[PDB]
Design a protein around this ligand. Structure first.
Ligand code: CYC
Ligand code: CYC
Ligand code: CYC
Ligand code: CYC
Ligand code: CYC
Ligand code: CYC
Ligand code: CYC
Ligand code: CYC
Ligand code: CYC
Ligand code: CYC
Lengths: 69, 162, 246, 172, 162, 172, 172, 172, 162
């Protein structure tokens, strides 16, 4: 994250609607139950794997904004 | 700020469960013994101003150089700020007594206290001597459970200062 | 006609009379009603999970920080000359989760100083598991993957492989302070995961500190060593004899 | 995240002066009924699964479409989660009854659940119906004079009524 | 094993901190309510046999089909094990009364309850009925405070089984 | 872990030799008789609770000292732990049965187990007896000829006997 | 980590028996004088920093080679380690005093302490001497008749002395 | 006829193996602490008339209908048979106590006793009550500490109670 | 079977009387003697395989012809049977050590030994000298007290054979 690509963090809005709730039901609750919708920030260098991860869990995003630029 | 009640709520919600026998028993002790601390707070709020002057005088005798110029204490405005600080500490001690817990005291004084002493170069020993005067005099105004609750809270404040 | 009517008084009487020999004290259980005393890991198991909800207050936030430091840095002391105040403030408003704050601590120079420089890479991987995950490593598959990831993508990606992992996602997630959980059977482990966490964990009082006599040598590569690469021992024996006889 | 005592302290600190006659008067009055409140809390926590089961049976009685396929609680997991949520709201109502302040329940869940149930597709008036069903069942279980000293607990019945009414209104 | 004492000490140590006022307050409430609870444990230990026998009777009467042959309740061994189980639950109720907390129950009976009752096909309802009975004459046997304590622990056990 | 396919591969490799024709013969035989192996594995799987419950009943019949106070399996948490251990050993035996070689059972399950029980204070003679009791109660399910084509399967019966004996000897 | 009550419960359970009447008498007597125990714990807590400071002053006056360059406690970090060790050990003695048994010590405080000190090169004799000095500094505060009710507490003094001696002997 | 040693030997023989280490330890511990067993057996033997007479007194005061004309212990012959049955049962309970095993009891005094009593019309409930009364009157003697070195014999008390309960539950 | 405790009980029972002093003294003597017997059983149990192999080889030494083809000893099955027989004798000797009586021998071996030796033409001298080998081998395995007990049982079995 030393170079220019590392900066310009982005703000991600994530919703965990039933498409993810059913997968959590079949898998189980091992972290405390939390609200479906929230707002999250992820760096550019780590934007790809984190968003692949949130799609893997089944959560659906609303929109993404740019904190810098 | 939380008392026994709200810490019980917090732990029961944290474990994702209802309130069991132990939680209700601790809340029972707190509810039943809320009274003596309430008369302790009564006796302390009757005597706030006398204690403000007593504490400032005691810290000034123990620290003579503070009043002299070249130190913070010199000046009437700084005298009034000392009086206001000790009044704040006394009010928060009565707040803790009423709340039956160190919650109000802790989050209104202790949270971010050492850094603030570092920043305005306030000696915690000034407040320690003032609160020691408060304790020594509190040995006479209050008797029984109320007195020991007041002294426990004053001792907690003193320990947190050091 | 043993009992035509509803009342069972004879059956209950005899059941109670015969239950007496069933509750006799067994052989012995002094050290057995808690084998954790043999593990010497009672405190870790009875230390409940510490979390940080959204509306959290000042109280236990310092407690959450203390738990985080005691877990991540071992029992090694952390002088407030080393505590990152900016990270704590970023946590106080929820700009970062507990997971993000733990990522930060892992990437501080205190964490590196303690676990990366005075140690080899095997020890670094073992400590990363024991601290950021709670468990011991299972096999050299993990060690090889992590060492290759280090040498190819830097300490940053190496620590991310621990923090943004799937395992960390379920077991702890965003708002749970890591705890030693290899003592209890974790699904899909070897029987050596429990043994490894037992060997790494020397006690509640002890710690995995750099600044000791031994120089913070590896504890578990000896343990993790034989199963992975000693299946070919028998034929390697004949090869070594053949070389020696020449 | 504040109870009656800490709420009064917060108001006293915002107005900045010591705590006065009347504030400490109501605080002592609340302190004398501390056991009177503990018993209601204990009744709620002891009858919790019973209240949940009774509310489930009723709510599925008057309104049937949820049981039928296509309902929000039709699949077996979804109605399991329905029982989970109704248990959680009952638990937070017990918390509110103990402390005396709606805020701990309100700020934690009342805001979030509204939009969350918009997202999930649950008709909120059914949730409010479940809330009033637990209201009735909990009143039934708490009015029980047996096994405890009698008293004028109308204050606590009224307070629980307020908690359930406000929960039903806010979810809807 | 959670007590008031042990829960307090574990919460304190989890924050690397000494025992403040509130923790000692909870412990004082526990020591003040340890008199009725030890009295209740003494009473339920005097009447252990009557309670066990009555509970076995009540389980059979409410579940008559169990004792008929080709079922679990048939044979001397399984009814002896029934009385053994009820003695276990009663022993741990008295333990939870003495320890003024549900530590012994949660450690012994509730730790791994459903998995054992499932792999041995045992039915929770049998033990729920036995405990309902024991609650029944626990109300009759204990006057006032000890009654409420013992009923709290028995209700904890019942809700764990339910 | 390795099945017998990758055993053949590894022994072919570590001598730098292609797989022989004879080795291909044994592995093709393994593949043709594979369907019976799937039948045996499914027999172990679908009847797991039965096997475990039967073995547990016999085990606590033989030595009551486990279940009485002061015994290893007593406090009703350690009973669940016992049943879970037996489930795990059964699961790994079925894995080794599907694979064809005991690599799964001897690597993922049996390496650190004997001294794990030594650390916990658990008797290992009782654990080995439990494994042998599961072998007995599982051969009867494995031989069940109902709802399946009939054929000779003494080979797989010897195979599963060897795996259970291997687990019991390793653990003890 | 077991208070007096849970230690007694564990012994009773191992004997597979209900709690005896004499044991209940012991526990009732313990819980009767428990206010004295609470006072002793509050004296060890309220007057803790004074105890650590005084014990450290006497320790570093009597044994000067620690603070010398090359000494074990020489730099600032090692002085802070000294102070935190002493505070932790006083904290654990207060914990044991409240609980009533040394279970908290041997579970958490002393679990691997000798191993740590033999690894760090610390002279365990010095740490034991520090715990002795904390004993002497703490007995003064425990015996403070001021601000409490007058009553014999010789049993508490002996118990706390045994706790400190056990901590020293485990460290030594 | 067996004792605990021969029971362990026979079970080992059925298994077919040498006696395990744990079984040897149990038998050695039984032998070591068997002098308490000798004291208990001597107490039962020495006081036997006292136990029998006290049990008879309490039983016949409690159950008047027996010693009435037409009652089942009415004439001197039936009364003597009653007392002789009590004495024989106590004798075999002391035998089983010395042997550490109830084989001699269930093998000589109880293999055909319920059928005999029923075929004689004797109330088996009263016989079980008599056995319980002997149990109480004999515990009063075993717990005596005169003439012997004080020690712990709770396990022996529980074992003798289980023998009396075996008789009383295999008669009724 | 027939041990010291069992013989005591049977004698006190045939006469139809309580256990008087002499019975208790014999019981005490056996209980105190049980320790040396227990570690003797430990020693023989630990050295099971070595003792069996040595006994078999002593057999094949003293009776060289038996190993020739056409006789009892020839054939791996017959060697295995010899090893099994030696294991049987050794195991029952350890049993009789633990029981502190000659019960297990007189039940599982000596009872009906001559008939079954005669039916299969088994030579008693075979086992006699194999037991002689074991007798010599416990000369070093066991020393002091327990050696007397082990020798006593070995020689009792030898006397039973001859
Ligand atoms: C069919 C033939 C037959 C007879 C005759 C008979 C007598 C008899 N004597 C008994 C003991 C007794 N016998 C007596 C008689 C004494 N009372 C004193 O005034 C006198 C000095 C003395 C009489 C001369 C007493 C007081 C007892 C009470 C001992 C006990 O309580 O067990 C009892 C036991 C009843 C009980 O304990 O309440 C009976 C049944 N039993 C029989 O089956
Ligand atoms: C603050 C504590 C807390 C609460 C209160 C809470 C409620 C809650 N219920 C949910 C799903 C649900 N909620 C319901 C219940 C509704 N449908 C019908 O049964 C009823 C009319 C009605 C309840 C009375 C159902 C059926 C689902 C399942 C939706 C799905 O799986 O897709 C969800 C979405 C994610 C999830 O399944 O966990 C939340 C957040 N969650 C929390 O962490
Ligand atoms: C950062 C400091 C550090 C280093 C460098 C290090 C080396 C290292 N070498 C390893 C194995 C190995 N090492 C070698 C290399 C050797 N074998 C050949 O004969 C060569 C002659 C010779 C190289 C000069 C090989 C081939 C393996 C793989 C062994 C196997 O998979 O069985 C391993 C374990 C698995 C892995 O390869 O990651 C480590 C960690 N460990 C450390 O803590
Ligand atoms: C550990 C949990 C706990 C329990 C079980 C408990 C029972 C309890 N009930 C009490 C009296 C009481 N209990 C109640 C409550 C009942 N009155 C009825 O109307 C209602 C059905 C019900 C309330 C929902 C009342 C009103 C009193 C009289 C005290 C008062 O408020 O003036 C008291 C005070 C002493 C006395 O009995 O006079 C206790 C300690 N206390 C506890 O800390
Ligand atoms: C520490 C706490 C603890 C508990 C609570 C406990 C319950 C318990 N009871 C058991 C026996 C049993 N329990 C029952 C059911 C009972 N018997 C019937 O007469 C009644 C209808 C019914 C009671 C109301 C049966 C039928 C068995 C033996 C049969 C089997 O295990 O499948 C078993 C299995 C052990 C064995 O095989 O003997 C457990 C685990 N055990 C514990 O160690
Ligand atoms: C994936 C491979 C794997 C295996 C096989 C395994 C065994 C295993 N069993 C355990 C517990 C246990 N297991 C038992 C079972 C024994 N008790 C009786 O003797 C029975 C005869 C016998 C069961 C066959 C008991 C009693 C415990 C708890 C021990 C204690 O609390 O002291 C534990 C300690 C963790 C826990 O508390 O659950 C392990 C590691 N672990 C693994 O990772
Ligand atoms: C859906 C997953 C799946 C299963 C379950 C499976 C088993 C399977 N076994 C078969 C035949 C068979 N199954 C068995 C095994 C049985 N006979 C022996 O006597 C035992 C009772 C027992 C094994 C221990 C045998 C021996 C055959 C005959 C095949 C042959 O001649 O080798 C067949 C072909 C006949 C048919 O399709 O109806 C299948 C599909 N294959 C699959 O893809
Ligand atoms: C269960 C709670 C707990 C305990 C008890 C504990 C003991 C403890 N003391 C330590 C260091 C230390 N402790 C001391 C203090 C001792 N040496 C001097 O002689 C003093 C007189 C004396 C104080 C009584 C010193 C000097 C060190 C540093 C030694 C070194 O760095 O080599 C360390 C190493 C941590 C680190 O790397 O900084 C531990 C684990 N830790 C814990 O988490
Ligand atoms: C934070 C909660 C809390 C605490 C801890 C507390 C302490 C407390 N101290 C008490 C008196 C007492 N305190 C003490 C103990 C003292 N005796 C001296 O020698 C020693 C310096 C010291 C103990 C080492 C004694 C002996 C009494 C008189 C009561 C008795 O003898 O049992 C009492 C009983 C009321 C009385 O008779 O005055 C309490 C409740 N009060 C509270 O609300
Ligand atoms: C001739 C028949 C015979 C008798 C009567 C006999 C008694 C006897 N009791 C002994 C000790 C003992 N005796 C007892 C039993 C008693 N203490 C318990 O508190 C109970 C009151 C009671 C049993 C219920 C105990 C506990 C010991 C000490 C055992 C030990 O811990 O070493 C000893 C060993 C030496 C001694 O300490 O005196 C003997 C020889 N020995 C015999 O050969």
């Amino acid at each position: 994250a030393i170079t220019t690509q590392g900066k310009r963090i982005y703000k991600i809005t994530v919703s965990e609607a039933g498409a993810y709730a059913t997968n959590k039901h079949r898998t189980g609750y091992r972290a405390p139950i939390r609200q479906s919708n929230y707002t999250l920030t992820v760096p550019y260098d780590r934007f790809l794997p984190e968003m692949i991860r949130l799609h893997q869990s089944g959560a659906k995003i609303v929109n993404v904004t740019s904190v810098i630029s | 700020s939380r008392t026994v009640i709200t810490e019980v709520i917090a732990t029961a919600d944290s474990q994702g469960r209802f309130l069991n026998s132990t939680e209700l028993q601790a809340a029972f002790g707190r509810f039943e013994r809320a009274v003596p601390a309430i008369e302790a707070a009564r006796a302390l709020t009757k005597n706030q101003d006398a204690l403000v002057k007593g504490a400032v005088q005691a810290v000034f005798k123990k620290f003579p150089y503070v009043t002299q110029p070249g130190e913070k204490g010199y000046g009437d405005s700084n005298q009034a700020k000392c009086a206001r600080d000790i009044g704040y500490y006394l009010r928060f001690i009565t707040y803790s007594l009423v709340a039956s817990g160190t919650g109000p005291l802790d989050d209104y004084v202790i949270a971010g206290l050492r850094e603030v002493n570092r920043a305005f170069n306030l000696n915690p020993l000034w407040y320690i001597e003032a609160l020691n005067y408060i304790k020594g005099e509190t040995g006479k105004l209050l008797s029984g459970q109320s007195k020991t609750e007041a002294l426990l809270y004053i001792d907690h404040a003193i320990n947190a200062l050091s | 006609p043993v009992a035509p009517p509803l009342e069972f008084t004879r059956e209950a009487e005899r059941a109670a009379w015969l239950a007496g020999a069933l509750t006799l004290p067994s052989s012995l259980g002094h050290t057995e009603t808690h084998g954790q005393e043999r593990i010497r890991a009672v405190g870790a198991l009875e230390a409940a999970q510490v979390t940080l909800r959204a509306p959290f207050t000042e109280e236990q936030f310092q407690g959450a920080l203390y738990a985080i430091y005691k877990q991540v840095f071992g029992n090694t002391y952390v002088m407030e000359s080393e505590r990152p105040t900016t990270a704590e403030s970023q946590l106080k408003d929820g700009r970062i989760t507990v997971r993000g704050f733990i990522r930060l601590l892992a990437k501080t120079e205190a964490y590196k100083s303690r676990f990366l420089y005075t140690t080899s890479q095997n020890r670094f991987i073992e400590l990363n598991h024991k601290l950021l995950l709670g468990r011991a490593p299972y096999d050299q598959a993990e060690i090889i993957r992590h060492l290759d990831l280090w040498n190819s993508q830097g300490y940053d990606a190496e620590i991310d492989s621990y923090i943004e992992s799937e395992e960390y996602q379920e077991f702890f997630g965003e708002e749970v302070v890591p705890f030693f959980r290899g003592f209890k059977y974790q699904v899909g482990q070897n029987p050596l995961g429990f043994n490894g966490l037992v060997r790494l964990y020397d006690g509640y009082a002890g710690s995995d500190t750099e600044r000791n006599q031994s120089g913070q040598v590896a504890r578990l590569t000896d343990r993790l060593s034989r199963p992975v690469r000693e299946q070919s021992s028998v034929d390697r024996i004949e090869r070594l004899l053949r070389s020696y006889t020449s | 995240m504040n109870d009656v005592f800490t709420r009064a302290i917060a108001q006293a600190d915002l107005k900045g002066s010591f705590l006065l006659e009347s504030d400490l008067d109501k605080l002592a009055s609340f302190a004398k009924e501390g056991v009177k409140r503990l018993d209601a809390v204990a009744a709620l926590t002891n009858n919790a699964p019973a209240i949940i089961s009774d509310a489930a049976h009723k709510l599925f009685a008057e309104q049937q479409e949820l049981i039928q396929p296509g309902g929000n609680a039709y699949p077996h997991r979804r109605m399991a989660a329905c029982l989970r949520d109704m248990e959680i709201i009952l638990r937070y109502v017990s918390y509110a009854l103990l402390a005396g302040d709606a805020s701990v329940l309100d700020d934690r869940c009342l805001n979030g659940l509204r939009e969350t149930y918009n997202a999930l597709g649950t008709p909120t008036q059914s949730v409010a119906r479940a809330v009033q069903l637990m209201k009735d069942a909990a009143m039934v279980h708490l009015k029980s004079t047996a096994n405890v000293t009698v008293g004028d607990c109308s204050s606590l019945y009224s307070e629980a009524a307020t908690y359930f009414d406000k929960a039903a209104a806010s979810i809807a």
